[PDB]
Write a protein that binds this ligand. Structure first.
Ligand SMILES: NC(=O)c1ccccc1NCc1cccnc1
Length: 294
């Protein structure tokens, strides 16, 4: 692979290291990801290849899939910053509401597109939401989870974050639905608003109990079928639900109403991306430009 000159290490992903690189022939600047192997599953090659056709303005474009020497490389369009860094850089003053709303609106458009094509992300987090100088925000790594799997540690034994995982996944449900992505985005929306993670669990049970402490321990009334989930235990403590006004102050009622629908326990009652786009919170949406210092 001498068709690319590594410019720097953009980081270490869940599957492999990611590099910023320039195509020696085209001059194009791209993001190159080396994927974890002994023969490379043929099942994963066809799945990944299908994603090359999943193109939308709010989805990071997958340019090419290169298979070789027990090694798989994914070539993606390059963006200069991620939302995790932007939030840290905006920690003192906070991201202005108009920009938070623009970003949430664009992310829901991207989810609506992928979900209409039967593609789920499964591991949304600030680190895989990328931004540019024009005020655009895009989702990175859609569909890779299903193509492969989701280990506990990265290739460098790094600890995978559980902060954005939906309760049905934590309770052992075997079949994920588009609803898991809406839950993760709701958690990110709350974090942009308050400037602190909503549910920063440091273990699977701590993550689950942090959710229960805030939204109340779920029961058959609010979540039909919950007591029959694979990892549900009758011994779970029973915490009362807290008021949203206390969860994401000082967000207005339009915002709290939308957030509450994105965080419904029952995956079937949780709002869809398409329906969320029509919520009154977006009546005055615009597209501001962020101040990025690259
Ligand atoms: N597609 C990409 O461009 C990308 C891929 C993986 C991780 C971060 C990424 N960009 C944002 C970024 C963050 C830090 C430094 N330079 C770029």
């Amino acid at each position: 692979m001498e068709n690319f000159q590594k410019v720097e290490k953009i980081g270490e992903g869940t599957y492999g290291v990611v590099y910023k690189a320039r195509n020696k022939l085209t001059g194009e600047v791209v993001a190159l990801k080396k994927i974890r192997t002994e023969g490379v599953p043929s099942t994963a090659i066809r799945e990944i290849s299908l994603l090359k056709e999943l193109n939308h303005p709010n989805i990071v474009k997958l340019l090419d899939v290169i298979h070789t020497e027990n090694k798989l490389y994914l070539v993606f369009e390059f963006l200069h910053q991620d939302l995790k860094k932007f939030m840290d850089a905006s920690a003192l003053t906070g991201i202005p509401l108009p920009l938070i709303k623009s970003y949430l609106f664009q992310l829901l458009q991207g989810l609506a597109f992928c979900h209409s094509h039967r593609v789920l992300h499964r591991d949304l987090k600030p680190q895989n939401l990328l931004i540019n100088t024009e005020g655009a925000i895009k989702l990175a790594d859609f569909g890779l989870a299903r193509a492969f799997g989701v280990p506990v540690r990265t290739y460098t034994h790094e600890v995978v974050t559980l902060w954005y995982r939906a309760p049905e996944i934590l309770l052992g449900c075997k079949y994920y639905s588009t609803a898991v992505d809406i839950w993760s985005l709701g958690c990110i929306f709350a974090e942009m608003v308050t400037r602190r993670a909503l549910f920063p669990g440091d273990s699977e049970i701590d993550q689950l109990f942090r959710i229960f402490r805030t939204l109340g321990t779920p029961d058959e009334v609010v979540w039909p079928g919950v007591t029959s989930m694979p990892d549900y235990k009758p011994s779970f403590p029973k915490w009362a639900r807290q008021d949203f006004s206390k969860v994401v102050p000082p967000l207005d009622e339009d915002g709290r109403s939308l957030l509450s629908q994105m965080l419904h326990y029952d995956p079937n009652k949780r709002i869809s991306a398409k329906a969320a786009l029509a919520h009154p919170f977006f009546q005055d949406v615009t597209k501001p430009v962020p101040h990025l210092r690259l």
